Write a protein that binds this DNA or RNA. Structure first.
Lengths: 101, 119, 88, 73, 270
RNA sequence: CUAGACGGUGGGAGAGGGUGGUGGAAUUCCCGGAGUAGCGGUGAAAUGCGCAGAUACCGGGAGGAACGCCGAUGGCGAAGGCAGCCACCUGGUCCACCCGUGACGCUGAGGCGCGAAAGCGUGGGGAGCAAACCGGAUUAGAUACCCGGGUAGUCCACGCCCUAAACGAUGCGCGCUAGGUCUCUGGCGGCUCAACCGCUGGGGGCCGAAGCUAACGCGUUAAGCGCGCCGCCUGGGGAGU
């Protein structure tokens, strides 16, 4: 396992209740997932660009962790499969690049 | 049944021919007009004269339900929008934007036999 | 990480004098030893020609040190042959 | 010959990766969707090689469409 | 010289041409029972269909999937080919009351888990409501019956992609009938086929199956002046787009209207 | 003994490759919608679709295949060949800090690999277009060039040939001989100039004394000076018989 970086998005139409439940399912993946956890910040809410899902609006979040390579091909699918999550991007972070800084 | 007066028009353009669209503030069209209506397509159409007599027919079934203010945008590359220009304020209408764009596949498909290489 | 991390064990175990940085014990071994995760590039990536020939430069060394260990000191010869066999 | 306004990398509080406080991805970016070649890119090209995907994420991520609008093409 | 595995496709030997059969199997003793059953070939004071109809009947037995569940924990281990068609048929397990043949994705050695429970396991599973289709891989257990659920019994295809989610609630494609969005509200077992192509895989010659299960046919044109026109020339056929008793050899369409296929359009085949 | 070859650290570069979800301007169309008389396409026209609602216009939909902008003297790349997000795996490549093994190597009809588009087969597949075939139409004549359709095909797996204005038409490798014009790229950092600068290396278009051809011209990536070895040519045709 190594340092990563994932971002998940889904159905914001539901109130904060049924909109932040999947987070729970991620918590179980933070401690009960072989290693442990890392850091976490939240974009909060930044409008996309063009309309999708028949709506130019939405709600957002973001994360960053470390997890077992094996459970990866199921960790993100775990929620991406349903009509909820529809876009995910896991990225082994470690030493990217900076705009001269 | 609208009588909104302040409407738009999904103007367009193409090589062989050209067809202007006149819709409402959100999309639903109305009818259609052109210059190549009467005998003017084979070799005749080779000139903007088609785009010329395009408003001299639309006004018939358009400037009837109270419409003297239309949005204006350029779409597609036509054989001669030049004449179509005469259909400007010269027909008692109105203008809006100077926008002039036209879609094109960034190689998204297979055009004709030739379409690449430089020099 | 791919540098000499794995090679660390090949220092107090499969090597010559304290600090063997380039003996047979730590030479062609790394090649075959790499095969473990090398053939792993065969699940898919079977078209990754930009790496398949990257091994063509070891086709020789793999069986280059021959007329030097069998034709003299059998030690550096059958040093670990009975651990990889010959001609598959 | 001739160019436009002086564009490059004055400030530096930003970053060609951080999204929480995006800036240059908007300001110094083209007023169109066209991936900055080298001229109008402002910077140059090296900070654009990978930059392309750094911002392209926005596309698939809905954060950005395809391109913008202009005039006279 | 391609698929998995052993096809007796003898490239011209001795009265045994390019065959094509079986695979692996743990080989089971023999089936414990086979409820109801009965037979085959003919029926209703008459006969019907003069194509195929050998000796060996039955063996197939029912395969009621999941009518209940609520909590089971199974395991899976053995397996056994059996129904009329070469298609294997799984072997299930549990320990509660009945067995019910169950389906079979791809083959397994000695392990698995199984749960058959709404939200259970990524791997092999069974019973669960229907909206559960993020990707929708190999099925091999589709079915149309509310309380019940079974359908297919063949090692051919068994893999359908699930559509979106709009009005009239319609989704899922089907084996070979292009574009026919079906209404849906049931289940299956979601799993592969095991030896896909293996379902119509060629045989050597003739005389060791067509009698031995089915029957000898490759005919046409009775040449029977009475109700069979085809037959009465120097050796040609001339005109007559007739099949038999003027049944229209060509398409001529057929069933339509119907319950369903009243909102299940697009069924055309190439 | 280390100049060569070889592996270590620390970083970086891209259209290198196999697999999996797909991002959207796409364009043929299925359907409803507004709902008129032509659309289309040539330098002049037409098979077609027209009075069944064609042309076009809003949406819901089926899909297959392609990947504009960046793109330019560009990069990857033995080479063929390759310019969408991310990931499992992986090839070749870069300097400084030398860590050491210590001649451990460059080539080589024969083979193994690659195997430009297309072409073979089994199953799949089908929007766009396309060999055969087929229309209006050139003209005397027109199985050309225009337009209009469409089958294998352009498409995934796997097994074939081994080919082309495949070209730096110049086989790999080493050392060497004025430089400059400019470009993608790594590194050490000069009164720490806060928009800089030198020095050093890999790839890449151009100019010239000189050497070289019979030239054009090669021109720092050498055809200038040699070498470690395989290749071919030896008057043309007929001849890849």
């Amino acid at each position: 396992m190594r340092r990563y970086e994932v971002n998940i998005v889904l159905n914001p139409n539901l109130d904060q209740s049924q909109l932040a439940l999947e987070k729970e399912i991620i918590q179980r993946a933070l401690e009960n997932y072989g290693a442990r956890v890392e850091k976490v910040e939240e974009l909060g809410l930044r409008r996309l660009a063009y309309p999708i899902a028949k709506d130019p609006q939405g709600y957002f979040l973001w994360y960053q962790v470390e997890m077992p390579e094996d459970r990866v091909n199921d960790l993100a699918r775990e929620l991406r499969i349903r009509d909820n999550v529809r876009r995910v991007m896991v990225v082994k972070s470690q030493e990217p690049f900076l705009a001269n800084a | 049944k609208r009588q909104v007066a302040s409407g738009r028009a999904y103007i367009h353009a193409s090589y062989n021919n050209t067809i202007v669209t006149i819709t409402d503030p959100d999309g639903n069209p109305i009818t259609w007009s052109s210059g190549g209506v009467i005998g003017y397509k084979g070799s005749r159409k080779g000139t903007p004269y088609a785009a010329q007599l395009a408003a001299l027919d639309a006004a018939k079934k358009a400037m009837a339900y109270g419409m003297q203010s239309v949005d204006v945008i350029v779409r597609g590359t036509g054989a001669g929008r030049e004449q179509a220009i005469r259909a400007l304020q010269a027909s008692g209408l109105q203008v809006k934007s100077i926008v002039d764009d036209t879609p094109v596949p960034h190689n998204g498909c297979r055009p004709k036999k030739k379409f690449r290489k430089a020099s | 990480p791919i540098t000499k991390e794995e090679k660390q064990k090949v220092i107090q175990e499969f090597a010559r004098f304290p600090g063997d940085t380039g003996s047979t014990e730590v030479q062609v071994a790394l090649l075959t030893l790499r095969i473990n995760r090398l053939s792993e590039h065969l699940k898919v990536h079977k078209k990754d020609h930009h790496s398949h020939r990257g091994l063509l430069m070891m086709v020789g060394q793999r069986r280059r040190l021959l007329r030097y260990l069998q034709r003299e000191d059998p030690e550096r010869y059958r040093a670990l042959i009975e651990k990889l066999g010959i001609r598959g | 010959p001739s160019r436009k306004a002086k564009v490059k990398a004055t400030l530096g509080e930003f970053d060609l990766r951080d999204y929480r406080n995006v800036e240059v991805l908007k300001r110094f970016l083209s007023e169109t969707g066209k991936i900055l070649p080298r001229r109008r890119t402002g910077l140059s090209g090296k900070e654009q090689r990978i930059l392309a995907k750094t911002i392209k994420r926005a596309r698939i991520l809905g954060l950005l469409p395809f391109t913008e609008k202009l005039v006279r093409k | 010289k391609k698929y998995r595995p052993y096809t007796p496709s003898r490239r011209q030997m001795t009265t045994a041409d390019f065959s094509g059969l079986t695979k692996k199997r743990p080989e089971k003793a023999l089936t414990e029972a086979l409820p109801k059953t009965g037979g085959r070939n003919n029926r209703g004071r008459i006969t019907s269909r003069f194509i195929g109809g050998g000796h060996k009947r039955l063996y197939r037995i029912i395969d009621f999937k999941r009518r209940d569940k609520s909590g089971v924990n199974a395991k899976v281990a053995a397996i056994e080919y059996d129904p009329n068609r070469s298609a294997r048929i799984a072997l299930l397990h549990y320990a509660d009351g009945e067995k019910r043949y169950i389906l079979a994705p791809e083959g397994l050695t000695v392990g698995a888990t199984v749960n058959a429970g709404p939200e259970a396991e990524p791997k092999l599973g069974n019973a669960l409501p229907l909206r559960f289709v993020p990707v929708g891989a190999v099925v091999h257990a589709l079915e149309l019956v509310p309380g019940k659920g079974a359908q297919l019994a063949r090692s051919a295809g068994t893999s359908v992609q699930v559509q979106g989610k709009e009005s009239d609630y319609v989704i899922v494609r089907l084996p070979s009938g292009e574009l026919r969005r079906v209404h849906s509200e049931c289940y299956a077992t979601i799993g592969a086929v095991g030896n896909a192509e293996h379902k119509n895989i060629v045989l050597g010659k003739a005389g060791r199956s067509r009698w031995l299960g089915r029957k000898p046919h490759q005919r046409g044109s009775a040449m029977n002046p009475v109700d069979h026109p085809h037959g009465g020339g120097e050796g040609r056929t001339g005109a007559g787009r007739v099949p038999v008793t003027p049944w229209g050899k060509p398409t001529k369409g057929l069933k339509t209207r119907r319950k369903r296929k009243t909102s299940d359009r697009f069924i055309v085949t190439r």
